Symmetry: C5
Subunit: 338 residues, 5 copies
Amino acid sequence: MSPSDFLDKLMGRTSGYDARIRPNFKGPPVQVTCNIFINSFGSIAETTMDYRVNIFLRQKWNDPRLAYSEYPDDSLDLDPSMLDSIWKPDLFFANEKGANFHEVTTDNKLLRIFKNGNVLYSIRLTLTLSCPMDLKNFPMDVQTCIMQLESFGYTMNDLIFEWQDEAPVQVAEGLTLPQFLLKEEKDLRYCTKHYNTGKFTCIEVRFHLERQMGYYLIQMYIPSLLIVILSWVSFWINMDAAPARVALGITTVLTMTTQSSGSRASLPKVSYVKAIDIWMAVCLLFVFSALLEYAAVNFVSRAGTKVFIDRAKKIDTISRACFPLAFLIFNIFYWVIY
Amino acid sequence: MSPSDFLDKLMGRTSGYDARIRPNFKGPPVQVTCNIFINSFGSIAETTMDYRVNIFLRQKWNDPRLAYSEYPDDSLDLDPSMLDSIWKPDLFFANEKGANFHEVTTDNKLLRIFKNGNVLYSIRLTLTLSCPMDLKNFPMDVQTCIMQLESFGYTMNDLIFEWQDEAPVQVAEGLTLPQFLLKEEKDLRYCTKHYNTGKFTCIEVRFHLERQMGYYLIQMYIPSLLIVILSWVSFWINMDAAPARVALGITTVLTMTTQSSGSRASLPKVSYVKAIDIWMAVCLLFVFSALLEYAAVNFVSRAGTKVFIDRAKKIDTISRACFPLAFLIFNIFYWVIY
Amino acid sequence: APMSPSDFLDKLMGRTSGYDARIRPNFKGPPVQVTCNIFINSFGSIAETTMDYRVNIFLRQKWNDPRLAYSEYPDDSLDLDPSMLDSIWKPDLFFANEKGANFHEVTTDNKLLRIFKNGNVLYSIRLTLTLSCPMDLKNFPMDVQTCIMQLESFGYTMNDLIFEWQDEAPVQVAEGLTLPQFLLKEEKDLRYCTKHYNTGKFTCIEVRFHLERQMGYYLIQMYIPSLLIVILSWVSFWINMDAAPARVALGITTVLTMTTQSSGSRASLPKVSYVKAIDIWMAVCLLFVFSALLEYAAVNFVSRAGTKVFIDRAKKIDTISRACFPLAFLIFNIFYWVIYKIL
Amino acid sequence: MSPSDFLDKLMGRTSGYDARIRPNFKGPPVQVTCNIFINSFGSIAETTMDYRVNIFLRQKWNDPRLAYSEYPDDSLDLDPSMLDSIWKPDLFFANEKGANFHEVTTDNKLLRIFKNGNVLYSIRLTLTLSCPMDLKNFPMDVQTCIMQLESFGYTMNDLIFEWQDEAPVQVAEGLTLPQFLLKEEKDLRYCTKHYNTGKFTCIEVRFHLERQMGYYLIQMYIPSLLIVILSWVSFWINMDAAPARVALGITTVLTMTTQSSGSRASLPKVSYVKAIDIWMAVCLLFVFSALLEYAAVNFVSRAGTKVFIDRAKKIDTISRACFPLAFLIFNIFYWVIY
Amino acid sequence: PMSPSDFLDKLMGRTSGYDARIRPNFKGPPVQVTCNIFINSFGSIAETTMDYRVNIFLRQKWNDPRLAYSEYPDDSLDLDPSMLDSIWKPDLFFANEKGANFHEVTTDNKLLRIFKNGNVLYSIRLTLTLSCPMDLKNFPMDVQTCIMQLESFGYTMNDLIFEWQDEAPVQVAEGLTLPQFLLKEEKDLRYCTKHYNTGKFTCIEVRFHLERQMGYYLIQMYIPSLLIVILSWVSFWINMDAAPARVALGITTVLTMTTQSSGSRASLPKVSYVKAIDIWMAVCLLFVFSALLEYAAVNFVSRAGTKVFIDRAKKIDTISRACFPLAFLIFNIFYWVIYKI
Ligand SMILES: CC[C@H](C)[C@H]1O[C@]2(CC[C@@H]1C)C[C@@H]1C[C@@H](C/C=C(\C)[C@@H](O[C@H]3C[C@H](OC)[C@@H](O[C@H]4C[C@H](OC)[C@@H](O)[C@H](C)O4)[C@H](C)O3)[C@@H](C)/C=C/C=C3\CO[C@@H]4[C@H](O)C(C)=C[C@@H](C(=O)O1)[C@]34O)O2
Ligand SMILES: CC[C@H](C)[C@H]1O[C@]2(CC[C@@H]1C)C[C@@H]1C[C@@H](C/C=C(\C)[C@@H](O[C@H]3C[C@H](OC)[C@@H](O[C@H]4C[C@H](OC)[C@@H](O)[C@H](C)O4)[C@H](C)O3)[C@@H](C)/C=C/C=C3\CO[C@@H]4[C@H](O)C(C)=C[C@@H](C(=O)O1)[C@]34O)O2
Ligand SMILES: CC[C@H](C)[C@H]1O[C@]2(CC[C@@H]1C)C[C@@H]1C[C@@H](C/C=C(\C)[C@@H](O[C@H]3C[C@H](OC)[C@@H](O[C@H]4C[C@H](OC)[C@@H](O)[C@H](C)O4)[C@H](C)O3)[C@@H](C)/C=C/C=C3\CO[C@@H]4[C@H](O)C(C)=C[C@@H](C(=O)O1)[C@]34O)O2
Ligand SMILES: C[C@H]1[C@H]2C(=O)N(C)c3ccncc3[C@H]2CN1S(=O)(=O)c1ccc2c(c1)OCO2
Ligand SMILES: C[C@H]1[C@H]2C(=O)N(C)c3ccncc3[C@H]2CN1S(=O)(=O)c1ccc2c(c1)OCO2
Ligand SMILES: C[C@H]1[C@H]2C(=O)N(C)c3ccncc3[C@H]2CN1S(=O)(=O)c1ccc2c(c1)OCO2
Ligand SMILES: C[C@H]1[C@H]2C(=O)N(C)c3ccncc3[C@H]2CN1S(=O)(=O)c1ccc2c(c1)OCO2
Ligand SMILES: C[C@H]1[C@H]2C(=O)N(C)c3ccncc3[C@H]2CN1S(=O)(=O)c1ccc2c(c1)OCO2
Ligand SMILES: [Zn+2]
Ligand SMILES: [Zn+2]
Ligand SMILES: [Zn+2]
Ligand SMILES: [Zn+2]
Ligand SMILES: [Zn+2]
C-alpha cells in the first residue's frame, strides 16, 4: 500500500478518525507517559525568581485507532504535519511564565506510531518556569526549582499523566551552570490539582540547585576581609594624628556600607535576614567599633598628662590583639554554623 | 449517537447554529458569571506602575441552542477546537497593558456544556494590569490594584457580567509575594462604563497589597541610623582637630545624601512628599546640624581665651545629650504617626 | 415572520449579497467622508530619552456605505459580530507618527461593528500606540511639551477618502486618568496634517496634547539638594583660616558633590546639544561652590607672611564673604525663578 | 465593466495570471525602480552599532499582464489585498537586524497600476539597520550608515534594482536628530552581490551623520576643564599644608579618572585610541603632574633651611605660570588638529 | 513548450501526485543533504548570557528524483519560494539555538532552485542566537570557541544524513569585523551525531574561534590600574611627619583600586574560578595595600622622636622607593610572559 493511501485510511479523509475524541473515550482514562531531555538549563534569576530550560518533551500513549497491519515495520516515523490530524494530550506547564515552540527551520516535532497503535510524540520547547527561592542562607543556599506537567481540560477520569519508569529525565552531556551545581538526583512526584472545575492530573519534577561558593569568596568575603584588616592599621597610627585615624575609620565604614548595599542590588527585596546580611552586619560592627575605639583614645587623652596618655595607649595595645582575635573567633562561628 | 454526529447536529454543518448570534438575541441580555483562579501574582512595579497575574478566567452563561438530550450525562467535556464554533462573550480587561493566551503544548482552554445548554469556558491568561499607586506613605504604604472585566462590543441590553456568588476569586495554595502581603479580602464591585458608543457592562475586583516593612528596616532605616550615630562621634573629638571633625561632618552629610537619592532611584518621579522623604530629610537635618555645631564650636573659640574656650566646650557637652535625645524623640513621633 | 439574522447577513454582505469590500462607498462619486473620534483609556510612558509616549485608545470611525443600508428590521441600528468587519469595506487609517502599534485580542478581538438603517457604520477598535513626540528641553524641568497624534490614509488620495474630526467631543479622556510627571491640559488642539508625497496627496488629521511637567519632584530631588551643597560650602567662611585641610576639604567635596549632582540629573535625558534651564542652575550653583574654594585660596595666599596687616586683610575677605556669598546667591535665585516662572 | 469583474479578468480566477511567474519571464530582467520616503530616523546606537528608520518603500516595474484598456483612467488605485494576487519583487534589506510591516489599522500598503501595466507598490517598514562605526574621532566623528536593497532569489538575469532618477530618497519635513546632523547629500551606489548561489542585484544608499559637538562641550570638555583648573589652586596653597595639597591632588586625579571612565561607559569596547581618550589622557597627565609637583615641593624642602625653602617656592611660582600656559598650548594643538 | 503553470502543476501540484510527507527514496538509503552557510553578520557576543548572534544564509542541497524534469533544456529552474511548501525538505534545526527567526520583509527571504536531475538548492535567511559556553580563565587574554550544530529533529540516521559541503562550506561576508574579537579564518568542521532515547540523529557542527582583542583592556583596565599603583608610590617621597597626607594617599589608592576591580567584574558572569584579571587586580591591590602598611610601619617605628628610630624609619622609605617599583616591574615581566607567551 502506498504511504499516501495508508495515511488517508488511518487518519485522513477516508479514515473517519476524529481528533476531538480521545482513545477509548467511553472507557478508562488515557494513560500518558512523559519523559524530558534537558537540552539546556540556565537564566536562574533571583530577582524575577524563575529559570529557563530548553527541553524535548516526550509523550507516550496508546490510540487503538492508529494500530496498523499494512506494514511489517514495528514503527512508522511520520511527518509532523500529521500531528494536527490525530488526538493528543493537552499537557501544559502549570508554573510556566513563558513558553514557546521552535519552528526553525521546520516545526521541531516528532511523530512515531507503532503496530499496536502506540504513539511517541516529542516536541521541543523553551520554558521559563517560576521557582520561588528561599534566600535565608544566601550565598550558601540551595534552591529547589520545579516543573509541573498538567492537563488543562481533561479530568482524572479521562486523562492521566505519569513519569516514565526508566530514565524519565535525561540531561545533555556536559551541560553546566556557571552559578549553580545541578544535582544528579531529581525528585518525581504528583501535584494532582483540585479546582472548582474538577480534579486534574499533574506530575512534577524537582531539580536541586546548589549555589557555587567560589565566586562569593573572591567578590564578597575576601574584599570585606580587606576593609576589616584595613580598619586595624589605625591601631598602629599615632594617637596624635586624629585626621589620619578618623579618615581611616570613616572610609572603612563607608566602604563597608557600599560593599554591603552593592551585594544587595543583585537580589529581590525580601523582608527576612539572609546569611550575607549577618556577615556584612558583623564586618560593619568591627569596622565601626574601631572608629569608636579612636574616639575613646582621643577622648581619654584630652589633658596631655602621662597618666591619661598611658591609659589611651593601653586601649590601642589591647585593640591590636583583641580586634583580630575577636574577628577570628567570629569567622570560626560563622563558617561552622553554615 | 456517535460523538462526531452529535457535534455536527449541535454546532456543526447540519446544526444551523450561528456563532454570530447571541443566546436569546431578541430577548433579555445574556447573563454571564465570571470567576478567576489566580495561579500567580507578581512583578508589582512602582516605576511602570503596574502588576502581573496568571489566571484561569472562567465564564458561565446559558445557550439554549446547546442544550442536549442525546446523552444521560449531566455535562460533556468538549475539545477546545469547538470554542470557535460557538458564541461566547467578548470579555476584555479594561485596564490591561499587556495580555496573552497560552498555547503550549496546546491551547490552554476548557469547554464544558451541560444538559440545559449551560456553558463553562475557562481560559488561561497572563495579564499585565495597570495599578496607579499612592506612594505618600512609602514604604509603609498599602496599594489597591484592580482588575476590570468588561464587554467591548455588547451593550447592557445584550450582555451583562456578574461575579459568581460562591468563591469568585480563588488564589493558588501557598502563593506568596516577596515585597507585599496579599490580603484575604478582595472587594468586588461594578465599573459600568458609559462611552459615546453606549453603556457597557464592567465588573471589578480589588486586591489589597500591604508592603512588607522588614526589607526597609535593614536596607534603609538602619543604615541611616548608622550615619546619624556616626555623626555624633564628632562631639567626643577634640575641638582643636578641625580637619577630623569637618571630615566626619562632610562625609556623614554626603553619605546621607547618596543614601537618600539611592532609595529614590527605585521609584517613579512623583511630585508629592512621601514618608521616606520626611525621614531622609530629618536624618539629613540631624547630620547637617552636627556640622553646623562644630562650625559654631570652632568659631566661638577663635580667640584662645578660657571664657570663649569654655563656651565652646559647653556647646559640645550639651550636644552629646541633646542630639541623641532629640533624635530619639523624633523617632517616637515618626513611628507613632505611621 | 421577520428574516433570520444569518440570511440577512448573507444578503447584505455575504455570499448572495454581491458586496465587494475592495470597492469603496460611492466609488465613482465624491470621496468617502470619515469622521473620527478617540477615547483615551490610558496615557503614559512619556520618555525624554526615546522621545515618545504611549496611549491606549478606542478609535471610532464613522462613514456611510449605502450598500449596508437596510429595511428588513425596524431597528435604527444593528450591533454586529466583529467577524463581519472582514466582509465590509473600511478606511485604511494609520498613525503617521507611530513607532509601535498593536491590536488587542484577549479574550476576543477588541472590536465593535454597528450599522444603521441608512447604511452608516460605526467602527471602534482598541489600540495601544507608541507615538513619537519630539521634545524641546530648553526649559527643563519647567518645560511644557506638545505631543501629537496623526491619523492618515495610506492608500487613498484626497479624491477617494477624507478624514475629519467629529464635531461634538472628538477626544474623550477616561475619568480620573492622571500622569505622575505631567499635567495633561484639558484643551486639545485639532488640526490638518494633509500630506503631499510623490505618490499623491493624502488626508491626515492631527490632535495635539499639551503636557505641563510637574515641578514638585524637582524641588525635592534637584533644587533643594543643590541648595544644600551651596549652603554647606559657606560654612568654610566661619572656619579658622589656619585650618587649611578642613577648609580645602569642604571646598573640594562641595564642588565634587555638585558635579556628581549635575551629571546625575543629565543621565535621565537625551544627549541634546543645547543649553537647558537645569544646566544654567547647575552651572551657577557650581560657580558659587567653586568661588568659595577660590575664596580660601585667596585667604590662604594673602596671609602667607604671618603679619597683622596681612592677617587682617585675609580676615576682611572672610567677613565680606559671609554676607556677599548668600546675598549674591539670593539675588541669583530671584532672577532665575522670575525669568523661568514668568517667561 | 464592473470593478469586481475587471479584477477577476485581470488577476483573479478567470484571468489565468500566475504570480509565480515574473514579467517577461523568457525575456530580459525585470527593471525595478526604487525610492524611499524617510518618515523617521533615530535610535542611532554606538554600543549595538546600528540605527532605526521608518520608511515608505516605493517600487516600480512594468507587468504587461496588468495593462488595461477597459477604463480611460491613466491609473487605478487598487485595494492592497490584490498585492497577494500579483507578482512582485522579493526585495530585502541586506544589512537589516530587525524589520517589520505595519498593520494598524489595516496593512500599510499601496497598490497602483497604470494603463500600460506599470505598477507602483509602496509599503511602510520599520527597519533596524547595522551601521559599523569608526569612533577614532569621537565625539567629533562623522558616521556613514548604509541601507542595502537586494534581491534574495532572483539573479541579475531575472531582476535588476535601480534607484529612481528624480528624488530617490525623500526625507520628512522638519525631521531632526538630537545627537546628529543628517547631511543633505546621500550617496547612491551598487552593492552587487556575488554568492555561491549566484550574482544578485543590490543598490545602496549612504547617509552621512555628523555628530553634534554642543552636548560634549557641556558634559565632557568643560567639566574636565574644571578638574584641571581646580588642580591648579594647590599652587597658591601654603607648602606647609601637606594634607590640603595632597587632598586636592588625589581628589582631582580620582575625579578625572571617574570622569574618564564615565564617558567610556556609553560606547562599545573598541580596541583603538579615540579622540576622547587623548583628551582624558592629557587632562589626567596635567592633574597627575600637579600632584607630583607638590611631591617635589614637599621633598626638596625637607630640611627647613632658607636655601631649600626658596628652591621649593620657585617650583610653585614657575608652576602657576607654566601649568596653565602649557594646558592652553595643548588646547590650541588639540582643537586645531580635529 | 509547456507553460510554467502546467509544469509546476504536473511536477509538484494537483495533477502531480507528489506527496511532501514522503522523503526522496523513502524505501531506499538515507537522504544525503549537503549544507553550507554564508555568514552575513556575526556579533552580540555576550559573556553574561553566554551566547552570540549570527545572520546567515543556510543552503541545503539534496536530490529528489520526483523533481527531475526534461520539459525544458535549462539545467536549472529558479522557482518561486511559495513552492517550498509543496515539496519535501529536511527538518534541520539548530541544536544549540536559544532564539531563531526567519526574515519576511519584504517577502519571505527564501530561495528555491531545482535541476534537471532532481537536485534541489534551498537557501533560507536566518537570525540565530546560539549558546556558546565560555572559559574565562584567561580573560581578557582569552580565546573562545563558539559552535553551531545543524541537526535533524525527526529523521534518524537511516532516513536522513547531513554533511558539510566539500568546497567552501562556510563563507563569511567581505569586510565583516567584530569590535571585541578577531574571528579566525580556520573553522573546524565535525560531527555531533546525537543518540537520544528516541534514536540516533544526524548532526554536523562548525566551530568558530574568537580571539579577544587586547587593545581595549590596555586602555581601560591595565593602564588605569598602573596609575593607582604609581600614585601609591608618591607617599614614599612625602614627609613621614605628614600622617594625614600619607594615610589619605594610602586609603584612596586602595579604595580606587577596589572599585576599579569590581567595576571590571560587573561586565562578566558570576563564575566561581580565578580569571587572569583577578590575579592582576589582586597583585595591584597587594602593592597598593603594602604601601599603606609601609607607612604604618614608618609611623610606628618612629614614635619616640629619637635619631636612631627616625633613621630606621627613613631607611624603610628609601628602600621602598627602589624596591616597590622594582618589584612591581618584576611582577609585570612574570605576568605578561606567562599569559602572552
Ligand atoms: C541599631 C543599629 C545601629 C546603627 C548599629 O548598626 C550596626 C553597627 C553600629 C550600631 C551599633 C551596623 C548595622 C547592623 C547593626 C547590628 C544589627 C544586626 C547584627 C542585625 O539586625 C539586628 C536588629 C534587627 O532589628 C532591626 C533584628 O531583626 C529582627 C527583629 C525585627 O523586628 C523589629 C524583624 O522584622 C526581623 C526580621 O528580625 C535582627 C535579627 O538583629 C542584622 C540583621 C542587621 C543587618 C544590617 C545591615 C546589613 O546591610 C545593611 C545595609 O546594606 C547597610 C548599608 C548597612 C548595614 C548596617 O547598618 O548594619 C545593614 O543595615 O550594627
Ligand atoms: C530648605 C532646604 C535647605 C538646604 C535645608 O535642607 C535640609 C537641611 C537644612 C537646610 C537649611 C535638608 C533637606 C530637607 C530640608 C528640610 C525640608 C523638609 C523637612 C521638607 O521640605 C519642606 C520644604 C518644601 O518646599 C520648600 C515643602 O514642600 C511642600 C510645599 C511645596 O510648595 C512650595 C509643595 O509643592 C510640596 C509638594 O510640598 C515640604 C513639605 O517642607 C521635606 C519634604 C524635604 C525633603 C528633602 C529631601 C529628601 O531627600 C531629598 C534628596 O534625596 C537629597 C539628596 C537631599 C534631601 C534634602 O536636601 O533635605 C532631599 O532634597 O532641610
Ligand atoms: C570655561 C568654564 C570654566 C571651567 C568655569 O566652569 C564653571 C565654574 C568654574 C569656571 C569659572 C562650571 C561650569 C559652568 C561655567 C560657566 C558656564 C556657563 C554658565 C555656561 O557656559 C557658557 C560657555 C559655553 O561655551 C561652551 C556657552 O555655550 C555655547 C555652546 C552651546 O551649544 C550647546 C550653544 O548653544 C551656546 C549658544 O554657546 C554658554 C552659552 O555659556 C553654561 C551653558 C555651562 C554649563 C556647564 C555645566 C552644567 O552641568 C555640566 C556638567 O554636568 C558638569 C559635571 C559640570 C558643569 C560645569 O562645569 O559648569 C557643566 O559642564 O562655570
Ligand atoms: C467524545 C468526547 C466529548 C464529546 O464531544 N461528546 C459528544 C461526548 C459524548 C458522550 N460522552 C462524552 C463526550 C465528551 C467526552 N469525550 S472525550 O473523553 O473523548 C474528551 C474529548 C476532548 C476533551 C475532553 C474529553 O476533555 C476536554 O477535552
Ligand atoms: C443577531 C445579532 C445582530 C445581527 O446580526 N442581526 C442581523 C440583528 C437583527 C435584528 N436585531 C439585532 C441584530 C444584531 C444583534 N444580534 S446579537 O444580540 O446576537 C449580537 C451579536 C454580536 C454583537 C452584538 C449583538 O453586539 C456585540 O456584537
Ligand atoms: C473600484 C476601486 C478600484 C478598482 O479595482 N477598479 C477596477 C477601479 C475601476 C475604476 N476606477 C477606479 C478603480 C479603483 C478605485 N476604486 S475605489 O475608489 O473603490 C478604491 C478601492 C481601494 C483603494 C483605493 C480606491 O485607493 C486605496 O485603495
Ligand atoms: C517561470 C518562472 C520559474 C518557474 O516556475 N518555472 C516552472 C520555469 C519554467 C521554465 N523556465 C523557467 C522557469 C522559472 C523562471 N521563471 S521566473 O523568471 O518568472 C522566476 C519566478 C520566480 C522566481 C525566480 C524566477 O527566481 C526567484 O523566484
Ligand atoms: C512515507 C514515510 C512515513 C509514512 O508516512 N509511512 C506511511 C510509511 C510507510 C512505510 N514505511 C515507512 C513509512 C514512514 C517513513 N516514510 S519516510 O522515510 O519518507 C519519512 C517521512 C517523514 C519523516 C521520516 C521519514 O522521519 C520523520 O519524519
Ligand atoms: Zn532529593
Ligand atoms: Zn476593602
Ligand atoms: Zn493650545
Ligand atoms: Zn557624501
Ligand atoms: Zn582549530
